[PDB]
Amino acid sequence: DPAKAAFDSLQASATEMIGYAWAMVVVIVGATIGIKLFKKFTSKAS
Amino acid sequence: DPAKAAFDSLQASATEMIGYAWAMVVVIVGATIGIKLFKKFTSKAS
């Protein structure tokens, strides 16, 4: 069955991209939250 | 880590200003107490 094989391959490619997307999100969100806390704690401390 | 360095610098600046503030306080308070004692002892002496 040609269709079975095809869908399997598609689903594997998708799985890989999702992997790369998670990596990126973690970096961007890391920085956003980083800056937010730096601004907040500096103010309270002083 | 960008945050570590940043907080260090802030804390150094603060330490310096506190230094300058102590200098000023010592001058102003020196004079306030000076005048108070001059008024008091002159009265008792006479």
- What CATH architecture applies to the domain A1-46? Up-down Bundle (1.20)
Domain ranges of chain A: 1-46
Give the residue from chain A lying closest to B6, CA to CA: A38
| In chain B, alpha helices (H) | 2-45
- Contact between A38 and B3 under an 8 Å Cβ cutoff? The reply is yes
Q: Resolution of this PDB entry, in A?
A: 2.6
**A46 contacts on B by Cβ (under 8 Å):** 14
- HEC sequence for A18-30: HHHHHHHHHHHHH
Test B14 with A46 for CB contact under 8 angstroms: yes
* Separation between Cα atoms, residue B36 and residue A46, nearest integer Å: 35
One-character DSSP codes across A1-46: -HHHHHHHHHHHHHHHHHHHHHHHHHHHHHHHHHHHHHHHHHHHH-
Distance CA A28, CA A25 (A): 5
Rounded to a whole number, what is the distance in Å from the CA of A37 to chain B's nearest CA? 10
- B14 vs A contacts (CB less than 8 Å): 46
- Method by which the coordinates were obtained: cryo-EM
User: CA-CA distance, B34 to B30, in Å (whole number)?
Assistant: 6
